[PDB]
Amino acid sequence: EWRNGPVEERLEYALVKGIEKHIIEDTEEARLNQKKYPRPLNIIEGPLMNGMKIVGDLFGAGKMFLPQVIKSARVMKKAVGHLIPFMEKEREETRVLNGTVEEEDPYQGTIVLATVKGDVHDIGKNIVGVVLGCNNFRVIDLGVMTPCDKILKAALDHKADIIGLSGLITPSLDEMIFVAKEMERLAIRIPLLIGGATTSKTHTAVKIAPRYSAPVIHVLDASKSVVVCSQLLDENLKDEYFEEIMEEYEDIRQDHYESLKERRYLPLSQARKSGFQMDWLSEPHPVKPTFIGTQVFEDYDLQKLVDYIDWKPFFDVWQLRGKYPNRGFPKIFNDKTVGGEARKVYDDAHNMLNTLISQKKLRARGVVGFWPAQSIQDDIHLYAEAAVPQAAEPIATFYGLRQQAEKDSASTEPYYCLSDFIAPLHSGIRDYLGLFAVACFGVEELSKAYEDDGDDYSSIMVKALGDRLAEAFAEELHERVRRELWAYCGSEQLDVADLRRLRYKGIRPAPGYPSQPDHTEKLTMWRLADIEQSTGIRLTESLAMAPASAVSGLYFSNLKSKYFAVGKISKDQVEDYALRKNISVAEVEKWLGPILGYDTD
Ligand code: B12
Numbered sequence: 001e002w003r004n005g006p007v008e009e010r011l012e013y014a015l016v017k018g019i020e021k022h023i024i025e026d027t028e029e030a031r032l033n034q035k036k037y038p039r040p041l042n043i044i045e046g047p048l049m050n051g052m053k054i055v056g057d058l059f060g061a062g063k064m065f066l067p068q069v070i071k072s073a074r075v076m077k078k079a080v081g082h083l084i085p086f087m088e089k090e091r092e093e094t095r096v097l098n099g100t101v102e103e104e105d106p107y108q109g110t111i112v113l114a115t116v117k118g119d120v121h122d123i124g125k126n127i128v129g130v131v132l133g134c135n136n137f138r139v140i141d142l143g144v145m146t147p148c149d150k151i152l153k154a155a156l157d158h159k160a161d162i163i164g165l166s167g168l169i170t171p172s173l174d175e176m177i178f179v180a181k182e183m184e185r186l187a188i189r190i191p192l193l194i195g196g197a198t199t200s201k202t203h204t205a206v207k208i209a210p211r212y213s214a215p216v217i218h219v220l221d222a223s224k225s226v227v228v229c230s231q232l233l234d235e236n237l238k239d240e241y242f243e244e245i246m247e248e249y250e251d252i253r254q255d256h257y258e259s260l261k262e263r264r265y266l267p268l269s270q271a272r273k274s275g276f277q278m279d280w281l282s283e284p285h286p287v288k289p290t291f292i293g294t295q296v297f298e299d300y301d302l303q304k305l306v307d308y309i310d311w312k313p314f315f316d317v318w319q320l321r322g323k324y325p326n327r328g329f330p331k332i333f334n335d336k337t338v339g340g341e342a343r344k345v346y347d348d349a350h351n352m353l354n355t356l357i358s359q360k361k362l363r364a365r366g367v368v369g370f371w372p373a374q375s376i377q378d379d380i381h382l383y384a385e386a387a388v389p390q391a392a393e394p395i396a397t398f399y400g401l402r403q404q405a406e407k408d409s410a411s412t413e414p415y416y417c418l419s420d421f422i423a424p425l426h427s428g429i430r431d432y433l434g435l436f437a438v439a440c441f442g443v444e445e446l447s448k449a450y451e452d453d454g455d456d457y458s459s460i461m462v463k464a465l466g467d468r469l470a471e472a473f474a475e476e477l478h479e480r481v482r483r484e485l486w487a488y489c490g491s492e493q494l495d496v497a498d499l500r501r502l503r504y505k506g507i508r509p510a511p512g513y514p515s516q517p518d519h520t521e522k523l524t525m526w527r528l529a530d531i532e533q534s535t536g537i538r539l540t541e542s543l544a545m546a547p548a549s550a551v552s553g554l555y556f557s558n559l560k561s562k563y564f565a566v567g568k569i570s571k572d573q574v575e576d577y578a579l580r581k582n583i584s585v586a587e588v589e590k591w592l593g594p595i596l597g598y599d600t601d
Pocket of ligand 1: 113114120121122123124125127128163164165166167168169170171193194195196197198219220221222223313314316317318319463464467510511512513514544545546547548549550551552
């Protein structure tokens with residue numbers, strides 16, 4: 001039907017509908033029309049950028065969703081990959097004629113995207129770097145583990161017009177303020193973009209924007225990048241936008257400083273006197289684990305993990321969200337707005353997952369452990385199996401945090417801590433604590449192989465599938481522990497439908513989570529369980545677990561254990577925690593940055 005149209009219309013239709021079936025043949029038919037395009041630069045600047053501008057406009061208007069944008073980007077990448085020989089020939093002809101290759105750039109501007117030495121969320125940065133290509137923007141993508149000095153150096157040598165940082169978590173955003181300070185003290189006026197769809201403007205306008213004398217714009221999604229980045233390149237709005245409405249940082253500073261008086265805190269001694277007390281003499285006695293030490297999983301069955309995968313986080317990668325009550329998997333498939341695209345991505349993911357779990361291209365790996373645990377106030381101590389806890393000495397210590405923000409008198413909720421879920425040493429009751437770590441190996445190779453091919457769609461899909469497999473492995477390993485390896489919940493008859501609702505007994509608070517935001521617990525876990533040497537899950541210098549598709553955490557078997565948020569803490573708890581950990585106050589003040597209840601500046 002659409003094949004009957006002219007070659008320009010065929011190019012536009014292929015770009016908009018994401019069809020690679022005839023892109024090369026249509027491109028050839030277009031270039032053989034030499035009179036219509038005297039320069040091989042003209043063919044891209046004409047029908048090709050026209051369709052991509054249409055795609056970007058539709059994405060910004062919300063009529064086209066992310067996977068179709070990715071497919072359109074793939075079609076344009078195929079067309080450009082076919083056309084590169086002719087672009088290079090034209091550039092060589094220009095060098096022959098005018099003497100040198102000119103600084104002509106078909107893209108509107110160059111953008112450097114970087115991910116800090118920390119947070120490993122790579123999918124969003126890649127989506128941005130390819131949608132800006134759909135927005136006709138040249139993107140220099142530095143990936144994960146990019147040093148700040150490397151970020152600045154790449155911005156300088158490549159003469160980047162914009163530096164884009166990536167952020168998707170609350171902790172470890174102190175590298176963004178660090179690079180902002182480095183950039184400010186280097187005295188460069190290049191505009192800056194911040195974070196992703198977890199970062200509120202509070203952290204931006206408190207520790208970033210009043211810290212740099214250049215435009216610092218925060219964007220929610222790359223759909224609005226068409227407006228946002230152009231307004232940083234449109235000289236009519238470049239000189240005015242960056243300060244006309246970014247003045248609202250003034251509200252963010254003054255109003256929140258005024259609201260700081262609303263926040264109230266208890267003394268740490270008073271908070272301890274109001275902790276989560278419980279009668280261990282009437283509580284059921286802890287169940288002894290089946291073994292003490294570490295049991296290693298070397299070739300875990302990927303086929304089994306598929307039954308435990310939850311897909312709503314996976315659809316959140318594609319930004320597919322429905323209206324209430326038809327929101328989330330599996331109700332997402334029936335919504336008229338996103339049903340077809342959700343079906344497409346789900347079937348593609350399942351097809352590639354079936355291919356991978358049958359070709360053994362991936363390999364799950366993990367380890368679990370169990371040790372006897374006794375709690376000294378706000379701390380957890382671990383002993384050997386044969387040792388007597390009251391007379392021997394601990395082999396590993398995990399330090400917890402207690403809630404300190406004052407609660408309204410209408411609520412009687414205790415000020416929670418992790419140590420409240422393990423029997424105290426003086427009580428005479430022996431308790432046990434567990435830990436685990438899982439990973440999925442091979443995602444960082446398949447993603448790179450797909451990217452070198454040019455199929456960013458498959459790369460993003462395989463990254464999301466690796467993340468899903470890692471979380472499913474963590475959930476399944478927790479399920480085995482509660483019933484087989486520890487057997488403190490053997491009477492349970494629940495399935496994955498209730499596992500997704502956190503209705504099981506016990507909790508697995510990962511280090512760095514609001515339950516205990518100190519990421520240094522992973523160091524003690526790795527030292528105790530020999531995880532790095534056994535399983536192969538490395539720890540980054542920022543305590544990020546490699547490969548990125550990895551999950552780790554402790555095991556608490558107490559019946560009354562529940563997830564909680566520490567909130568905000570005062571300097572009293574900071575110094576107490578520092579003296580318990582036998583480390584300087586400066587280290588604690590930087591590891592617990594997000595949860596500090598006072599401003600040091
Ligand atoms: C997949 C995912 C990951 C992946 C990241 C992908 C990858 N490269 O592997 C991985 C496996 C790394 C993962 C792990 C973790 N993650 Co995670 N993860 C998710 C998840 C499940 C899906 C959401 C998603 O991926 N959206 C797609 C993202 C990647 O793209 P995006 O943000 O939509 O991108 C857009 C905008 O944000 C913006 N944008 C984004 N980046 C940039 C950059 C620039 C320059 C610009 C201009 C714009 C821009 O534009 C984009 C256009 O769409 C969410 C669950 C949820 N609640 O949604 C949790 C979530 C984001 N993860 C989170 C956390 C806690 C973690 C961990 C730290 C857990 C841990 N181990 O302690 C670990 C990291 C450490 C480790 N070694 O695993 C939290 C963050 C909240 C918090 N407490 O801080 C979430 C919300 C889970 C939760 N509900 O609590 N995670």
